[PDB]
């Protein structure tokens with residue numbers, strides 16, 4: 077009875093205050109229906125607690141507490157809106173996940189890892205989660221807004237010189253090392269998940285496919301994840317059964333990224349997705365550099381050292397061998413201070429809602445239930461306030 | 463988000479810590495079944511929380527934490543056991559209420575009033591609740607043990623002189639005034655619910671039929687409650703529809719009690735229950751004193767002043783007129799200090815488990831559910847620790 081004063085207040089615990097309230101609020105939501113109320117055990121309880129619960133729901137953060145300035149990202153289960161909290165006047169990126177889409181698709185437990193990393197990472201390399209809440213229809217994540225836009229946008233607006241490519245690649249290696257040292261492998265390293273902040277420095281903004289490492293730093297997984305252009309050969313092959321791999325899969329993606337940034341195209345580009353999988357499986361033959369592409373000796377060397385089978389890939393003896401590669405040799409920054417040195421592309425913003433670095437972008441209730449189905453159960457424990 | 467640090471810690475609130483845990487524990491219990499787990503919303507949630515919940519259940523007070531010395535009372539839904547807490551070695555009376563009997567009988571919300579009064583009354587006239595807990599099968603209430611036994615037992619072991627009858631009646635009036643001043647009318651005032659403690663002083667030990675008063679001190683009720691011998695005429699008639707009455711119904715029972723204690727029989731005794739109801743409805747004619755019964759002028763006067771229709775009953779202008787009745791005139795105590803004066807019958811106990819003042823006294827699982835039925839829902843919020 078001693079430890080509970082601890083557990084309840086510990087933000088990491090699954091049974092803290094906010095989670096206990098989520099439960100009691102999800103229970104009332106999932107039981108208050110016409111048919112269900114014919115049962116009396118249910119109708120009684122809904123009597124005692126329904127009033128007090130509706131009052132508590134009044135003190136809960138709400139979507140209405142925010143103005144939707146505009147949509148800046150689109151997800152598989154919702155969008156990411158640029159918003160301004162009405163009372164504070166502060167701006168944030170707010171991601172929405174539809175409870176109905178996740179339930180219908182039977183994919184209602186993929187967000188825990190992301191929620192945890194963005195909330196507790198406490199790292200300059202990870203987009204920060206200020207608070208997470210929910211209503212009967214959606215899940216909400218209020219995060220720090222990254223006005224710099226992603227790297228897919230930076231790569232299409234500038235012809236990137238090696239000086240920049242070193243900078244970004246170095247920050248990507250540091251961001252992933254931070255994630256690995258938290259016990260996770262990313263598995264979806266790509267330009268779309270890399271955002272630039274107000275100063276032009278990098279942060280990872282998506283962790284939907286992260287996974288907790290072993291006691292050896294490895295994971296057992298039989299599902300190929302990540303965008304086709306960036307899936308490493310070991311992750312691709314794990315789709316055929318008994319995949320066992322470590323963080324080296326993120327290092328492969330860095331190679332694809334560096335290639336794409338300096339060559340202008342992804343190394344295993346193909347007109348079909350299956351075409352790309354095939355190139356990847358046959359990387360020994362399929363990788364090749366364009367004749368007119370002008371790339372330094374070291375740059376081409378680093379790309380080839382990442383783009384090989386795991387057993388001989390750069391980083392197989394630790395991140396230290398990646399950091400000492402000659403391609404990173406320079407006079408502006410070192411591995412300890414890169415984030416406090418001038419970024420290559422400093423954003424030029426005209427206001428707290430300037431979303432010029434983001435391309436523009438262009439409603440299904442649950443069927444009232446017969447008997448209890450528990451559709452709010454998977455989201456008990458999502459709520460979070462710093 | 464400010465008030466919650468309050469609510470959660472306020473023992474009176476329905477959504478405090480212990481209640482939030484009851485919910486999350488009742489939910490897991492009511493969802494963890496073979497058939498129910500075929501649904502995935504349920505199976506997922508039962509995965510995330512089932513482990514942590516079973517650990518928390520380990521830190522919960524348990525029936526095994528107590529030795530059952532013997533059964534001292536029997537209830538409609540369970541028994542009252544004399545027990546010793548194993549670790550502390552302290553003795554208590556522990557009442558058990560079967561969840562299955564309450565559910566089957568559809569009477570799973572009658573205990574709230576009692577739980578509240580015994581837990582928060584903080585009065586020398588009310589048996590005290592130290593803690594309430596529960597397991598999947600029972601509800602438990604750990605109360606202070608009253609070794610003196612009840613007044614049904616005292617009346618059958620002694621021929622009670624008026625000196626004593628004043629003492630007990632005065633303590634009964636004070637105990638009920640305490641209950642009324644809490645905003646409740648008792649409605650089951652009888653010798654069985656009156657217990658004597660270690661010193662021989664009185665306390666009320668049952669509040670199963672209490673009801674919150676109006677803003678006028680009255681209640682609207684259409685159900686006759688209480689044991690037949692003690693039901694007042696207004697409570698009996700309310701069974702026929704539109705009952706509206708106040709605390710005067712408790713004063714009537716005091717009259718029945720005083721009569722029984724001095725005459726040796728209840729005033730409206732009959733061989734059948736229906737016989738007794740009839741006498742009560744016809745109290746103007748049915749009340750009469752035995753020829754050989756020797757009762758003082760004042761004693762007989764008080765009995766008759768209580769045993770009349772409400773409109774002319776003693777106490778209709780407040781408890782003050784009851785306390786100043788001449789029958790209570792005496793040299794041992796006054797209304798302010800009666801509880802700290804020598805009791806008439808001081809218990810002679812040989813140990814902390816002496817239950818000689820209590821007569822001796824001489825298993826049905828719920829059918830595994832098909833779909834959710836929620837049988838643990840009515841008891842969410844029962845848990846309580848001082």
Ligand SMILES: O=S(=O)(c1cccc2cnccc12)N1CCCNCC1
Nearest residue numbers: 148149150156169221222268281282
């Ligand atoms: O650019 S996002 O809208 C975005 C995500 C998270 C935090 C953000 C903060 N600021 C702007 C955009 C943000 N985004 C989601 C959809 C595609 N995947 C990765 C990035």
Ligand SMILES: O=S(=O)(c1cccc2cnccc12)N1CCCNCC1
Nearest residue numbers: 534535536542555607608654667668
């Ligand atoms: O005597 S009890 O067992 C009892 C109740 C509550 C607290 C007690 C404390 N000590 C002894 C007996 C007690 N009891 C229950 C059954 C019949 N109704 C009223 C009294």
